[PDB]
Symmetry: C3
């Protein structure tokens, strides 16, 4: 029963009220955050949506996960405000989410500024589990926040090479890669040509992955026919995304400075990763 | 084909003969014993049943597991006698029980006082696996043994708060709890009120589990309407029970000194845990 | 679409061309090699088949795995030649084989003597994964190679005791055994008698496995009626075989010096282990 964004909150002290009947997305998101070794999660609440921001440990991957108010069962926020969340503190809580829980509710109150409430309801036995999590008023990492604008559809012209993987294909490819390498070359000749993923280790092993049919992986290219697009990229952050299997299918966009953007949409959740090279 | 208690034993030297077509209960019981870190198992044989006694490592939880002779396929014991069993010695043996085994047989002979025989039969290939386990004549822990009387239905009046969990509910609740705490408060106001399980950790996290409908968890209360029942309990031994998932559904009884009794009945097996506070 | 051995190779530089639509056998074979802690794999190519040779770490078990050219989808070899393969180098590659791969292709070229190509094709997305593995020209372990002749059907007369296990029975028996022992006694009286597997550890545990019906495990015996066949054998290498579960059913042959031969046939794969005592 989804009602979207509300004009006024149920409880009068609520600066934020959030409810949603697919709490498993929070588990997967936070498994992703754990795989990235994020220490702290930056949370922006606005009247239209809530956004989770984080870097990975190496600071080179930027993650922006957005849940649109209009797509959940219940949403309310008084204004724009920020919360900082210790990821390790909430790790076991998000992992405890399972199928006995059909609802997740999130509440932040004016009279309790350092507290974030998480309520999970079990409907078979009228059980209600309430977490009270200590949160902070976060110093803002502006570079991370501004990255959100630098993944707008508008700005993605300098990305001549795109394609789509299911989460199983992505996991397979990059787990296979990380068995033997930390870096992989992405190479694609202009024109109707195959996509190459490969690396070479001298006097041991080389590996080469080739995609012969572009339409089977929804590849699109604006590489000039006579040019070769070739970048070298670090793959650990990709395996992290892949393994967390947050969402069904994943769009991959490449640019010639070797930046990678992964986009993934699961229901109310919009997930963006940009990783610099 | 269940025949219950027998007048005379098949083999003439048998002080004990025991056979049963659900050997998986022994696996689960002994997984429970392992989770408790029991070192030694105290075994009482009588002409009507066999009972396994143990404490957990901390000595504060008492376990009494009874298999009634009348409920198995074959039973015989000459008299009352005691055996001590090294739990670590038999650990891998009980764990090796699987579905290829449709029968467990236990024999103790007069001419072999320090030996306990365990025979598992595989009927697909006429395979017979016989363990000969070195056992001892145990010094008796009387406190442990007498506890059996202190869980008689008769004596459980001073237990004003009772309810029932399935093994999945019990595992869920106490694994969720042990993610963050070693102690939990059980609190229940007199009257038609909700059951509370909760704890509080300062400047990090608090958690609160609430059961709104008593009938959904078969709760019964004799707490005086105007009184509050509140106890604090250690939860490790509970997770042990929960995880071993010995039996389908579990009765929980509380008293105001904070003692807990868990009762569980699987077929021929009756399992009682009392844990002092 | 299986065409067997070819007169001439597709690619003109190929000293070896091999293709096969059951690549999972390579995964299992190499899981077996890993369980044995083999360091190096000895590979013989001939115009009719390819054979993998190895010892286990203790040097007492000899493994000979043969894939007959006539039974695969495509085979070609110019002549007889040998390759050495570092097992640890290829370990993750063989383990990455899964159901997305419907074809494995192996190529060795004249112009690249130190290289072995492994190509796996994914047909859902026209994906082609190519490994280039550094290989060597191996010094030959003749004892290992000659063992192949010493498992010919012709030479197996001095093996009076044989029987067959499924891989589940073999795994069960020897995992159960290795819980408690490194050695087991195989004992079988002449005549229509039960097969005994057993061991004895003083003042702890003894175990005895008995097979009452010979026909249920396809046992055959040429032990003279009045004689007792009894050998003691090391079981680690057996658990290795069992666990790798390379093939559906396994023939076990025993001789009185306590040598054991395990034989197993999966499709194109013929697998022989002889382990000396």
């Amino acid at each position: 029963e989804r009602k979207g964004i509300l004009e006024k909150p149920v409880r009068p002290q609520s600066r934020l009220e959030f409810s949603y009947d697919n709490p498993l997305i929070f588990k997967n998101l936070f498994i992703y955050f754990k795989n990235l070794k994020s220490k702290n999660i930056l949370v922006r609440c606005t009247p239209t949506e809530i956004t989770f921001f984080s870097r990975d440990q190496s600071q080179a991957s930027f993650v922006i996960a957005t849940i649109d108010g209009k797509n959940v069962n219940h949403y309310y926020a008084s204004d724009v405000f920020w919360l900082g969340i210790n990821r390790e503190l909430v790790e076991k809580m998000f992992n405890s989410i399972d199928r006995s829980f059909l609802k997740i509710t999130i509440v932040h109150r004016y009279d309790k500024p350092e507290t974030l409430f998480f309520i999970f309801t079990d409907f078979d036995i009228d059980k209600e589990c309430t977490y009270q999590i200590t949160v902070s008023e976060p110093e803002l990492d502006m570079d991370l926040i501004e990255m959100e604008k630098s993944i707008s559809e508008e700005r993605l012209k300098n990305y001549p090479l795109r394609w789509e993987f299911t989460s199983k294909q992505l996991k397979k490819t990059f787990s296979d890669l990380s068995n033997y390498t930390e870096l992989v070359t992405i190479e694609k000749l202009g024109g109707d040509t195959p996509l190459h993923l490969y690396f070479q280790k001298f006097n041991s092993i080389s590996y080469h992955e080739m995609y012969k049919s572009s339409n089977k992986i929804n590849l699109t290219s604006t590489i000039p026919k006579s040019q070769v697009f070739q970048i070298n990229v670090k793959i650990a952050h990709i395996k992290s995304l892949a393994s967390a299997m947050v969402t069904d299918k994943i769009r991959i966009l490449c640019e010639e400075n070797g930046n990678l953007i992964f986009q993934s949409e699961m229901d109310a959740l919009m997930l963006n990763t940009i990783t610099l090279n």
